[PDB]
Amino acid sequence: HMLTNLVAEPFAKLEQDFGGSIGVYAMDTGSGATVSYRAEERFPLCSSFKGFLAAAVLARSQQQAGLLDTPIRYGKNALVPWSPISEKYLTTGMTVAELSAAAVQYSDNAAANLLLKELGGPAGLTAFMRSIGDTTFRLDRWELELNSAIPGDARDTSSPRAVTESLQKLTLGSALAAPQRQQFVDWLKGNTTGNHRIRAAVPADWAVGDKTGTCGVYGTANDYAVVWPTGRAPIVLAVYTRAPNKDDKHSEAVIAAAARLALEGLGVN
Numbered sequence: 001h002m003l004t005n006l007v008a009e010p011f012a013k014l015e016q017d018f019g020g021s022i023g024v025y026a027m028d029t030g031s032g033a034t035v036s037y038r039a040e041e042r043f044p045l046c047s048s049f050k051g052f053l054a055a056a057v058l059a060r061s062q063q064q065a066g067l068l069d070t071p072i073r074y075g076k077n078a079l080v081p082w083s084p085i086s087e088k089y090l091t092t093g094m095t096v097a098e099l100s101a102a103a104v105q106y107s108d109n110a111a112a113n114l115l116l117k118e119l120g121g122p123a124g125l126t127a128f129m130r131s132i133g134d135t136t137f138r139l140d141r142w143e144l145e146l147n148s149a150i151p152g153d154a155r156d157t158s159s160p161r162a163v164t165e166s167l168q169k170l171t172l173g174s175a176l177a178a179p180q181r182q183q184f185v186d187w188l189k190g191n192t193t194g195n196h197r198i199r200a201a202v203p204a205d206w207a208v209g210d211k212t213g214t215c216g217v218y219g220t221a222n223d224y225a226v227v228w229p230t231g232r233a234p235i236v237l238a239v240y241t242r243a244p245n246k247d248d249k250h251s252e253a254v255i256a257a258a259a260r261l262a263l264e265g266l267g268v269n
């Protein structure tokens, strides 16, 4: 409900110090109060699509009883850079559930590409997002090409608002059956790659689940989260950055600061 004006000036200052663009959308699921800053602009997803990928697998598991237990074998040529779990199981294979947990909690690229194949590719994940009423999300390519983060390129992008709206439907709404919903939440809560991003703005006594993304170019990186502050309804938020020059560096500190400003805007402790 507006509330951005409490923190609209602070966002523009943070953005000016960063030297690029910051996109934020945060929702108090109790009141429906929102904070928005560049919330409708497109930003590259980078690895952040992997959370939605795991949710799409869980949705398919509601129709296919054996799916999560299915063993998947893969060759050395499936191991693209940043595959920290799948590299340890090359000689054995992993289950669909294990690949989904690795994609979410370690951002594992081979795991992401293997689960994309299971869903019919980037268009299959895009189709899942359309099925929950997200008209903004678009995945077009696979790992690692989807990380190009070219200025003006809508491929492999969404908006902070659409990311938050979809995360709410999947973690707190009715887009997944209850058991699948709690599995998605538990995967996000167990993420290992987000300690310096939204989590850095969240007190130790609040539960949080998140998914990160880092493209490695154009100052482009992001995080989205569900946060459970004690004694009030959960908050859902998305923080995305990009910058104009290919060799601009991302900043985890800027993502944590933007998250802090979003929570302060919502009046959250």
Ligand SMILES: Cn1c(=O)cc(CP(=O)(O)O)c2cc(F)c(N3CCOCC3)cc21
Residues within 6 Å of the ligand: 046, 047, 048, 081, 082, 106, 107, 109, 144, 147, 193, 211, 212, 213, 214, 215, 216
């Ligand atoms: C640098 N970096 C990080 O810090 C953290 C992550 C994990 P994320 O935050 O994306 O979940 C990461 C993931 C990558 F896929 C990645 N590559 C992108 C494609 O080009 C090669 C580098 C880099 C990455």
